[PDB]
Design an enzyme around this catalytic site. Structure first.
Site, PDB file in Angstrom:
ATOM      1  N   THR C   1      37.329  40.453  40.328  1.00 53.20           N
ATOM      2  CA  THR C   1      36.124  41.317  40.347  1.00 53.20           C
ATOM      3  C   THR C   1      34.901  40.379  40.285  1.00 53.20           C
ATOM      4  O   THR C   1      34.660  39.381  39.629  1.00 53.20           O
ATOM      5  CB  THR C   1      36.230  42.336  38.995  1.00 53.20           C
ATOM      6  OG1 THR C   1      37.417  42.942  39.280  1.00 53.20           O
ATOM      7  CG2 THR C   1      35.047  42.844  38.838  1.00 53.20           C
ATOM      8  N   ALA C  49      39.640  49.104  34.340  1.00 48.49           N
ATOM      9  CA  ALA C  49      39.070  50.029  35.468  1.00 48.49           C
ATOM     10  C   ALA C  49      39.218  51.691  34.679  1.00 48.49           C
ATOM     11  O   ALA C  49      38.053  52.118  34.755  1.00 48.49           O
ATOM     12  CB  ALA C  49      40.123  50.255  36.531  1.00 48.49           C
TER      13      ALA C  49
END
Ligand SMILES: [Mg+2]
Ligand SMILES: [Mg+2]
Ligand SMILES: [Mg+2]
EC number: 3.4.25.1
Lengths: 240, 244, 212, 235, 204, 195, 222, 233, 231
Positions: C1, C49
């Site tokens: 990420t 998430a």
């Protein structure tokens, strides 16, 4: 726990406990609020039945809720302390979570909500208190003045009075206060507030309290001599 | 069900008065008179015990004057048992404050706390209020010597001189007449006793019918002393002031 | 990420990658790592998430309730603090969150708050979060100016994610761009990193180490 | 005394019936539903001229697609509005959509009978809930303290309600425009109000699909009042 | 890690002829780091003295707690608390935290105001009373203090002789402990006079 | 957070606190102010676990501000430090303790004296002429022990503080990105903008 | 020590068409090296033209599906028989999953249906409720074997037009339901060969405007 | 969280043309000790259902009491308790499966593996499994523990898929079950020779066979086996 | 009189007045009819409007695919009791994979209503319910009173003027019970039954509300132009 429904409707659609709480407000000493162009003034009556009082330490009628907002009241003194404490806690809680002090409207809405809650909760009676809440919103120069009552309704006022003989001083304010041109200075606003109390008070000695609130947390209480000068000037113009 | 038997202790009258508060105040008006007088160099607390007996052990007896901490004391007028409940709460509050801030509790903060407790009994819970009025005599370094009173409503006010209990109207008039702002403790002692001597329902004012206390900075240098007077010491001050 | 956000003359630029991995396995290349809290507020996804999606959607509900009650747009300060105070209650329970709450109001101007699952709440001008954050910071620090144009700022954010996507194994897929103004955020498209890399290589003269 | 949840010999709850009397003393509120939108209007009724009338808030937003007008003990409405706003937002959080106007109204009405010896008494306020959804279009509901709610094409509540409702009986048809509805609310408010109607002592609002819930400016309402005066003088 | 030896420090108490003595070092540290040389570990509530070693936050907390409790005691009882009674209060108070205890080693010292009898007592962290005739020790150098006291002590010492004995017991014990020292105080307690003496010692 | 220092001189208290905020691999910020004003004449700096530090500091700030309004009176530095100590002493036996160390610098307007209090996360309070938390004292205390005088001016206090920071910048492995310095005296709290 | 979780194997696949959607899954249920069942349905019709599968730990999977079916029932009761849209169903499932954030449903959930414009829709969830709309998504044991194939044959990744040599991509032309089912069958046939937990049978649920249809195909039983 | 103490081994079952068969041995093991030799692990519920239980015996006896209470409760205010509103296999299973999953979700499981065998109102065969984790599945043959590894392979040769069920008679099915029980006795160290067998048929109802023994065993070949490699004598 | 202040007080003749007053609320409510054959069960309900601008208050509530009711009296009380039935139907399906028997549903409603008649502070329910359903023993019709009394019937009616419809059903008993496999004719009989309770007003398109459940028929409600066929 004690759960008894004290505030209930009557056949004619009235809640007598809330209406009797207003009768306690009627008995309380007179309080008045007047907003000028760049200020708000809170005037309060002190009954002179109590002398030998220690005025240094006796609870004052106007209370700071935060550095920029003040609260005065008419009605039961003990009841008002509970509303003041709750308001002060909420003011600091608002600063802590929102990172901004309360608006005058928000603080009013909170206090009014507490008052309403005590009119439909089990085992409690309504507050025998009406309040005048005044101040300036953060980074704002527009004067704010609100009123609350035992039922929990609230509203904004150009000028307002509550307590005993408030019918008389409201009469005075309704003919003397012009909306198109409010008291332009601190002097003019204080003068009009003292004038309104002199319709009801008795002697202009230690019976009138005055508190001036200006923008940016500028709050000051006038002394006896400062108020006495307003009292003197008003009657000397009246002798004509 | 149970509703049938509920007196509803926390309601307004049609005139906007609290029934039980008003009736508790009526009870207190029959209690022994207690007086407090504040001077520049101290405070006096004087109080009348109610129609005593010769067989009452006076030197170990306490019904009027109570110590809350080393700086604050109270005079009681009303139900003694009710007063002791509140007194113990106030003693705990003073110690809680001292533990938290490492400073003796300011007088008004203690008075406000007790007054708020009384207020609660008038607004919620459906219980009878405490049938007690207090005179608070105390000192702190902010306001100095202070006199307060609180009543069953939970309202409190500050005073230069004040009376509670029986004949307060007569007592307050006499205090209002002879009190001056530059007065001293020794003068205030005399005023308190003279006032009780004139207002009393008894035939004569004697040592066995009184409780007396002073709060003085008459403690060696920059500190405050509480003196709860002994029976012999009340007898001596009665002779000194020329009442017996 | 890799996620970033920076303040400049023309508001805020928000840029993120699109990759999601489960160990070495690339589960998705089409992940939306910018959460559209409301038309004026954005939040970035890093760490958990679900934690980021759930609580920043919840945050939008709280911001909506605020403006209904107060009749006024919520401040970025107040919005960020609602989220940070919430996650602080859960501290120790295992929430994983590293986000930038981004907004542009009258009283504050363009504002970014880094909010994090151990309770941290930091106001700042430039923030980069994720496994490729160090790569993005290099491009940002050496090219950032306050007086960047909206066009050049959008490119800088795009180019900084590309730098991370190239080097960081767990960053890639595509780049999502956003420009936050006072009147709201504006979406500036999805950009495949595969196609973007070759385009940037040729046009810029960068990545001479890579044969194309 | 007697129970708060007691039935009368006629089969009605005393406290609910008494709260309905409090609502009759309240200021007038009117709603009219059309195919172009729903209009909501209220009488402000300031107790004194020194009271700043724009602080009187008797029309309120619940969500973008749902508005609400009140009559009676208006302080009691605050917790009802709070619940409604929370219910609307919560449903959007759970279902990523707008909530149906009926479902919102039903959620508010579930609070009504939660009183006993829960809150100590019923609410002393009636609500007109107006809104739009995709399934049933433009809607107007009347939420009472009994827990009952009726859908209406048009409805008046408060002190001038029965006179206003008789007027709405004659005037409403299924082809009304939004502009026609605005004038109609103003006309009927003017009829039942004690004081003379103007932009400061009355307030208008509407809900449309495109623009959502909007409270009308005093300047906007003033023009509609002037338009009303002229069309009544036209015959 | 061990809470009783983070901050360091010692207390010792002794009996004499118509007198008692209680003494403590002045150190407060964060393990190896010396933080304060003015951390007194002896407190008094009326004529009853209480020394407390161990975790410094608990030392402060317990002083505030016993001040609280002895103040209320005095108001209700209309008299100052005695050493024998106070000892039982400490024990009770500590045992009520049996499964989450204050990490301390308290020591009580005083003379009973009615009987005139010298009194000392010690406790473990959960309240077990040790009422010794001769001496009580506590802290990170308790082993060292036991060794000094056991050889230096003799019964019925006069106040000024007892001062020398307890001072030498503390000082030499503290100088064999890394976490004790940095100054010292000795209280000599008689029925109606109490003297407090600060000792000169090495500052390492 | 890392380095927090404090020194009490003749007529003021000076607090110095590092500007760096590091989250593992990267330095996220280099201008962070690790302090809160509790009252007009009382300042508290802080360091400890992320999140808990600011949460604790703001919680204390709110409570002292509440007291100030209720009584219309500023609590003494001693009174504030005792309130803070009790909160931390309460915290250490909680389900999840506040892992926060603080310095409280205040000017007592009644006694006309500056006061510096050092309190760790356990609730261990000491009044000191100079203090620190963490490893900061290990580097700086030998310099303070040598140079410190109770009659120092504010300017001399700042110079002694500069020497302490220079030693930290020389021997500490971590880059703490300099310090923000604030002075607490009779006139209130002010920040030294060039250091 | 007691382990509240288990692994029942299985593989599922959801593909969104232009005006349709499919959700497929194998019918084999296992623990360790044993077969529990050769035919244990894993993809379910939940009502309102929504199909669902929660692959992984079958007890948690059955519980979640059962709760969602119940949520659909109560959505009808509470909101005047309103049809639950696929996007609303997705958000609702997030809340079901995140409600057990600190004791998760050990499953990978996929739902399929049509959006409010009639276009094909698939949504994919992690065990704790993070979700996204997707075109193509395999879950479970053999997901790593299937997805790279789908990237290549559905999205035409790494495929360019002959003669241009990398300059022009192969255009993304829309696939029919028959074409998608061919890819699904070939995905599972290939997964069966190389993954021990995949086999026995393949059940596909197809969703159109006309409703929900089923198709079954045998797989290798070894 | 616990550990099983007194335990029961395999439960095996299969479907046939008109109904279902289920079987389980009569042993209660205490680790390697074969402590209790008269334990009934098949528990009938009415005349249409048999619940076979393996694993912890104390938890089995608890489940046995739940099922007994279920029958009592179903009869309350139920005039059709012995007719249209009698307990079905599907009702009994769903109840148990709910309990098992609830108990695992409180981290306090019933340490069992259960097979519910029966015939429904419409004559349909019912056979479904549930265990301590709340995991459920159905198949033409079902078995727990060792039975899963050794019985299922043998029973699957008779009924390999759904279409084999109408082709399988009760004689063939019982034969297959009985043979499987012999194989388990040869090869499971926590098994016994004595077992119970239950048949639930849509025509002939519930037949419950107790005190069955494994017979026709092959051991004679053991005499020729000498040493472990090189030993001749 | 002196014994009607609360539900916890018997009168000297052993009556519970608060319960009787709750029963009175049902008589004020609009008429609703219930009837059944061996294959189907039907509810017919006359809906009531506030005025011409208002909608007609809904009377029928679905509880499950195989069960539902019609109400007469306090509508919010019907919502509470129907919600409880929905939950009990649902518990039976989830836990036991079993459709809840109509008779057992009646028993659960009786017991819920009873608790409110024996305790201080509460009040009785102010609504009457007609429950229809199709379960394993065929079609069923129940009548619920807030006293707690639940009764299984072939047909009935509750509300204002319900006696007319009840007499009609008592005459027609032998005819309508035999209407098997013909849903339209069974509804016709129900519409003809409720017509015996009308005065001044007649059955219009937005006035009438019908519900049916049967052998291969889920519980479905008909309103609007879907009932014009039966007018
Ligand atoms: Mg040493
Ligand atoms: Mg050393
Ligand atoms: Mg295979």
């Amino acid at each position: 726990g004690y759960d008894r429904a004290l505030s209930i409707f009557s056949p004619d659609g009235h809640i007598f406990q809330v209406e009797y709480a207003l009768e306690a407000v009627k008995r309380g000493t007179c309080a008045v609020g007047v907003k000028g162009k760049n200020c708000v003034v809170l005037g309060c009556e002190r009954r002179s039945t109590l002398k030998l009082q220690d005025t240094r330490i006796t609870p004052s009628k106007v209370s700071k809720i935060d550095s920029h907002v003040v609260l005065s009241f008419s009605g039961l003194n003990a009841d008002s302390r509970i509303l003041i404490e709750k308001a002060r806690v909420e003011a600091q809680s608002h600063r802590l979570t929102l990172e901004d002090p309360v608006t005058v409207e928000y603080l009013t809405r909170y206090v009014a909500g507490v008052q309403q809650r005590y009119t439909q909760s089990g085992g409690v009676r309504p507050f025998g208190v009406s309040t005048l809440i005044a101040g300036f919103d953060p980074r704002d120069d527009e004067p704010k003045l609100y009123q609350t009552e035992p039922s929990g309704i609230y509203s904004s006022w150009s000028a307002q009075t509550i307590g005993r003989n408030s019918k008389t001083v409201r009469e005075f304010l309704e003919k003397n206060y012009d909306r198109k041109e409010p008291p332009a200075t601190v002097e003019e606003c204080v003068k009009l507030t003292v004038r309104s109390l002199l319709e009801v008070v008795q002697t202009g000695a230690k019976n009138i309290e005055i508190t001036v609130v200006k923008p940016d947390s500028d709050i000051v209480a006038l002394s006896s001599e400062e108020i006495n000068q307003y009292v003197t000037q008003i009657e000397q113009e009246k002798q004509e | 069900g149970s509703r049938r038997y509920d007196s509803r202790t926390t309601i307004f009258s049609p005139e906007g008065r609290l029934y039980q508060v008003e009736y508790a105040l009526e009870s207190i008006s029959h209690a022994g008179t207690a007086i407090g007088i504040m001077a520049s160099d101290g405070i006096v607390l004087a109080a009348e015990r109610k129609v005593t007996s010769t067989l009452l052990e006076q030197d170990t007896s306490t019904e009027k004057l109570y110590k809350l901490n080393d700086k604050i004391a109270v005079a009681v007028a009303g139900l003694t048992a009710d007063a002791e409940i509140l007194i113990n709460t106030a003693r705990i509050h003073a110690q809680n404050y001292l533990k938290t801030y490492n400073e003796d509790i300011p007088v008004e903060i203690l008075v406000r706390r007790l007054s708020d407790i009384k207020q609660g009994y008038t607004q919620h819970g459906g219980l009878r209020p405490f049938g007690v009025s207090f005179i608070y005599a105390g000192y702190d370094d902010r306001y100095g010597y202070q006199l307060y009173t609180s009543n069953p409503s939970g309202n409190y006010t500050g005073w230069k001189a004040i009376s509670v209990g029986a004949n307060t109207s007569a007592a307050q008039t006499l205090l209002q007449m002879d009190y001056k702002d530059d007065m001293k403790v020794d003068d205030a002692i005399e005023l308190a006793l003279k006032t009780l001597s004139k207002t009393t329902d008894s035939s004569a004012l004697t040592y066995d019918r009184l409780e007396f206390a002073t709060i003085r900075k008459g403690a060696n240098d920059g500190e405050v002393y509480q003196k709860i007077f002994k029976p012999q010491e009340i007898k001596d001050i009665l002779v000194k002031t020329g009442i017996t | 990420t890799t996620t970033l956000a920076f303040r400049f003359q023309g508001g805020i630029i928000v840029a993120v990658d699109s990759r999601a991995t489960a160990g070495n396995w690339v589960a998705s290349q089409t992940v939306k790592k910018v959460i559209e809290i409301n038309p004026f507020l954005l939040g970035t996804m890093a760490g958990g998430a679900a934690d980021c999606q759930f609580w920043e959607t919840w945050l939008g509900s709280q911001c909506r309730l605020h403006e209904l009650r107060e009749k006024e747009r919520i401040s970025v300060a107040a919005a960020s603090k609602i989220l940070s105070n919430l996650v602080y209650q859960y501290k120790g329970a295992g929430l994983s969150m590293g986000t930038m709450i981004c907004g542009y109001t009258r009283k504050e101007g363009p504002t970014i708050y880094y909010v994090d699952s151990d309770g941290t709440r930091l106001k700042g001008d430039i923030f980069c979060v994720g496994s490729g954050q160090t790569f993005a910071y290099g491009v940002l620090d050496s090219n950032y100016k306050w007086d960047l144009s909206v066009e050049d700022a959008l490119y800088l954010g795009k180019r900084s994610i590309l730098a991370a996507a190239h080097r960081d194994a767990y960053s890639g897929g595509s780049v999502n761009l956003y420009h936050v103004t006072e009147d709201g955020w504006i979406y500036h498209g999805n950009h495949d990193v595969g196609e973007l890399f070759w385009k940037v290589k040729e046009e810029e003269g960068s990545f001479n180490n890579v044969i194309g | 005394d007697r129970g708060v949840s007691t039935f009368s010999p006629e089969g009605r709850l005393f406290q609910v019936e008494y709260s309905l009397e409090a609502i009759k003393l309240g200021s007038t509120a009117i709603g009219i539903a059309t195919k172009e939108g729903v209009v909501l209007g209220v009488e402000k009724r300031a107790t004194s001229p020194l009271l700043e009338s724009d602080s009187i808030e008797k029309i309120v937003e619940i969500d973008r697609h749902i508005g609400c007008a009140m009559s009676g003990l208006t302080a009691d409405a605050r917790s009802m509005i709070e619940h409604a706003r929370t219910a609307a937002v919560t449903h959007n959080l759970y279902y990523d959509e707008d909530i149906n106007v009926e479902s919102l109204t039903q959620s508010v009405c579930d609070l009504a009978l939660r009183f006993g010896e829960l809150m100590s008494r019923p609410f002393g306020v009636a609500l007109l809930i107006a809104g739009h959804d995709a399934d049933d279009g433009y809607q107007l509901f009347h939420a009472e303290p009994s827990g009952t709610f009726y859908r209406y094409n048009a409805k008046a509540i408060g002190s001038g309600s029965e006179g206003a409702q008789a007027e709405l009986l004659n005037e409403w048809h299924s082809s009304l425009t939004l502009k026609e509805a605005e004038l109609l609310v103003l006309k009927i408010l003017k009829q039942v109000m004690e004081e003379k109607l103007d932009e400061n002592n009355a307030q208008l609002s509407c809900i449309t699909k495109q623009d959502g819930f909007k409270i009308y400016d005093n300047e906007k309402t003033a023009e509609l009042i002037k338009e009303l005066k002229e069309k009544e003088a036209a015959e | 890690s061990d809470p009783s030896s983070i901050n360091g420090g010692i207390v010792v108490a002794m009996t004499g002829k118509d007198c008692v003595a209680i003494a403590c070092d002045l150190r407060l540290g964060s393990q190896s780091l010396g933080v304060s040389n003015k951390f007194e570990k002896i407190f008094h509530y009326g004529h009853v003295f209480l020394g407390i070693t161990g975790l410094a936050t608990d030392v402060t907390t317990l002083n505030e707690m016993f001040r609280y409790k002895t103040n209320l005691y005095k108001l209700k009882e209309e008299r100052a608390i005695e050493p024998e009674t106070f000892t039982q209060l400490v024990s009770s108070s500590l045992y009520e935290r049996r499964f989450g205890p204050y990490f301390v080693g308290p020591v009580v010292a005083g003379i009973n105001s009615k009987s005139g009898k010298p009194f000392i007592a010690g406790f473990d962290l959960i309240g077990c009373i040790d009422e010794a005739k001769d001496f009580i020790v506590s802290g990170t150098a308790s082993d060292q203090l036991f060794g000094m006291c056991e050889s230096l002590y003799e019964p019925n010492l006069e106040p000024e002789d007892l001062f020398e004995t307890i001072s030498q017991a503390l000082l030499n014990a503290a100088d064999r402990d890394a976490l004790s020292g940095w100054g010292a105080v000795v209280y000599i307690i008689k029925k109606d006079e109490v003297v407090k003496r600060y000792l000169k010692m090495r500052q390492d | 957070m890392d380095i927090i220092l404090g020194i009490r001189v003749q007529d003021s208290v000076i607090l110095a606190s590092s500007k760096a905020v590091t989250r593992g691999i990267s330095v996220l910020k280099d201008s962070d102010d690790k302090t809160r004003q509790l009252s007009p004449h009382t300042l508290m700096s802080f360091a400890g676990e992320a999140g808990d530090t600011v949460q604790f500091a703001e919680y204390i700030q709110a409570n002292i501000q509440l007291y100030s309004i209720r009584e219309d009176y500023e609590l003494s530095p001693q009174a504030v430090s005792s309130f803070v100590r009790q909160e931390l002493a309460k915290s250490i036996r909680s389900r999840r303790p506040y892992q926060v160390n603080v310095l409280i610098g205040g000017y007592d307007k009644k006694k006309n004296k500056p006061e510096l209090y050092q309190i760790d996360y356990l609730g261990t309070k000491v009044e000191l002429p100079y203090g620190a938390h963490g490893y900061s004292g290990f580097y700086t205390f030998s310099l303070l022990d040598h140079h410190y005088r109770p009659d120092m001016t504010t300017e001399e206090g700042l110079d002694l503080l500069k020497l302490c920071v220079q030693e930290l910048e020389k021997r500490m492995p971590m880059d703490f990105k300099g310090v923000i310095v604030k002075i607490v005296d009779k006139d209130g709290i002010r920040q030294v903008d060039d250091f | 020590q007691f382990n509240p979780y288990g692994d029942n194997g299985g593989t599922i696949l959801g593909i969104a068409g232009e005006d349709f959607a499919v959700l497929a899954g194998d019918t084999r249920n296992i623990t360790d090296y044993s077969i529990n069942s050769r035919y244990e349905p894993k993809v379910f019709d939940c009502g309102d033209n929504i199909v669902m599968s929660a692959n992984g730990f079958a007890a948690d999977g059955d519980a979640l599906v059962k709760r969602f079916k119940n949520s659909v029932k109560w959505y009808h009761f509470d909101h005047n028989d309103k049809k639950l849209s696929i996007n609303s169903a997705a958000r609702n499932i997030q809340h079901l999953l995140y409600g057990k954030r600190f004791f998760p449903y050990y499953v990978h959930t996929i739902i399929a249906g049509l959006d409010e414009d009639g276009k094909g829709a698939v949504y994919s969830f992690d065990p704790v409720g993070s979700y996204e709309r997707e075109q193509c998504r395999a879950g479970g044991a053999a997901a790593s074997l299937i997805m790279p194939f789908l990237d290549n044959q559905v999205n035409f990744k790494n495929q360019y037009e002959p003669g241009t040599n990398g300059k022009v991509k192969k255009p993304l032309k829309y696939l029919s339901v028959e074409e998608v089912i061919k890819l699904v069958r070939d995905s599972f046939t290939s997964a069966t060969e190389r993954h021990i937990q995949v086999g026995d049978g393949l059940e596909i649920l197809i969703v159109t405007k006309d409703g929900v249809r089923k198709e079954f195909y045998e797989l290798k039983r070894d | 969280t616990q550990q099983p103490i007194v335990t029961g081994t395999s439960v095996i079952s299969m479907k046939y043309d008109n109904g279902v068969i289920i079987a389980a041995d009569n042993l209660g093991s205490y680790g390697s000790l074969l402590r209790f030799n008269g334990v009934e692990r098949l528990i009938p519920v009415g005349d249409n259902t048999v619940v076979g239980i393996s694993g912890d015996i104390s938890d089995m006896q608890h489940i046995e009491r739940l099922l007994k209470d279920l029958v009592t409760e179903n009869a309350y205010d139920n005039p059709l308790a012995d007719a249209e509103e009698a307990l079905e296999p599907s009702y009994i299973f769903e109840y148990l499966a709910t309990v098992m999953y609830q108990r695992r979700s409180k981290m306090n499981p019933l340490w069992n593996a259960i097979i519910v065998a029966g015939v429904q109102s419409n004559g349909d065969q019912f056979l479904r499994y549930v265990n301590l984790l709340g995991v459920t599945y159905s198949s033409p043959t079902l078995a727990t523990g060792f039975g899963a590894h050794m019985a299922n392979p043998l029973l699957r040769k008779v009924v390999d898929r759904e279409s084999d069920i109408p082709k399988t008679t009760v004689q063939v099915a019982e034969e297959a079950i009985v043979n499987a029980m012999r194989v388990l006795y040869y090869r499971d160290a926590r098994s016994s020779r004595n077992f119970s067998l239950a048949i639930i048929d849509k025509n002939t109802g519930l037949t419950f066979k107790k005190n069955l023994q494994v017979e026709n065993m092959k051991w004679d070949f053991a005499k020729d086996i000498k040493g472990y490699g090189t030993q001749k004598i | 009189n002196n014994y009607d202040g609360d539900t916890v007080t018997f009168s000297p003749t052993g009556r519970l007045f608060q319960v009787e007053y709750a029963l009175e609320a049902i008589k004020q409510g609009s008429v609703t009819v219930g009837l059944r054959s061996n294959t189907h069960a039907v509810l017919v309900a006359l809906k009531r409007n506030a005025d011409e601008l208002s909608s007609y208050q809904k009377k029928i509530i679905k509880c499950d695919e195989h069960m539902g009711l019609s109400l007469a009296g306090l509508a919010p009380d019907a919502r509470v009791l129907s919600n409880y039935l929905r939950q009990q139907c649902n518990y039976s399906s989830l836990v036991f994979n079993r459709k809840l028997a109509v008779e057992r549903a009646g028993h659960l409603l009786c017991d819920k209503a009873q608790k409110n008649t024996q305790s201080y502070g509460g009040r009785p329910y102010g609504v009457g319910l007609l429950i229809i359903g199709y379960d394993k023993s065929g079609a069923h019709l129940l009548e619920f009173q807030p006293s707690g009394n639940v009764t299984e019937l072939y047909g009935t009616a509750i509300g204002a003027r319900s006696q007319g419809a009840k007499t009609y059903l008592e005459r027609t008993l032998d005819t309508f019970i035999k209407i098997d496999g013909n849903p339209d004719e069974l509804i016709k009989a129900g519409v003809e039954a409720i017509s015996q309770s009308l005065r001044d007003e007649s059955l219009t398109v937005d006035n009438l509300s019908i519900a049916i459940v049967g052998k291969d028929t889920p519980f479905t409600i008909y309103d609007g132009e879907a009932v014009a066929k039966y007018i």
